[PDB]
């Protein structure tokens, strides 16, 4: 829904700064990378790059598949694996966008999970996982 709702702004303030009680931070600070949600981001990112194992299991793969939040572009997924998981060999990333899984819970409401973003990275030297039974 593109249409902006009134409440959604108000609910944004009350957590950004205690809205009815604490006066706002001056508009200069809000336009700055030192504003807390821009500071809680530049230093404490919040991302869920979950790895699918069904493609990286006992079968060797050069193309392990991930899921990354819808708003992680390609060159960020590089930066991510590079600086957080030491992965240094990514020549091409291949990115879809998938409607989050949907289903009917036993009650009956259609409980649709959040949506994600398949990003089939392509490492140089293939990777694998062992599973001893």
């Amino acid at each position: 829904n593109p249409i902006a709702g009134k409440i959604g702004l108000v609910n944004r303030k009350a957590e950004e700064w205690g809205w009815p009680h604490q006066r706002p931070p001056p508009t200069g600070l809000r336009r700055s990378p030192e504003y807390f949600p821009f500071f809680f981001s530049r230093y404490f990112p919040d991302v869920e790059v979950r790895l699918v194992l069904d493609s990286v299991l006992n079968n060797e793969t050069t193309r392990p598949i991930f899921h990354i939040p819808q708003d992680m572009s390609k060159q960020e997924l590089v930066n991510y694996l590079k600086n957080i998981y030491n992965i240094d060999n990514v020549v091409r990333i291949r990115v879809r966008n998938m409607r989050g899984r949907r289903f009917k819970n036993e009650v009956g409401e259609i409980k649709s999970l959040p949506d994600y973003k398949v990003a089939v990275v392509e490492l140089d030297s293939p990777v694998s996982i062992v599973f001893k039974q």
Partner: protein, 66 residues
């Protein structure tokens, strides 16, 4: 092209009441370019302009993006 607050770059994801009539016609209609290929929306799952990664830069002819 959604854009980051700090980024001086300007994107056309407006939500003013005067601009949502065209921002839906991008998400549900999509664009049929006069070259024959359907643009931004061509298939089933309509994009979510507000969950796009931010506009990083204008395109160039020689490379892709400055």
């Amino acid at each position: 092209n959604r854009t980051h607050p700090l980024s001086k770059l300007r994107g056309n994801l407006r939500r003013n009441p005067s601009e949502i009539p065209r921002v839906l016609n991008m998400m549900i209609q999509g664009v049929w370019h006069k070259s024959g290929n359907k643009l931004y929306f061509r298939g089933g799952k309509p994009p979510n302009p507000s969950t796009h990664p931010y506009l990083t830069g204008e395109p160039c002819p020689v490379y892709g993006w400055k």
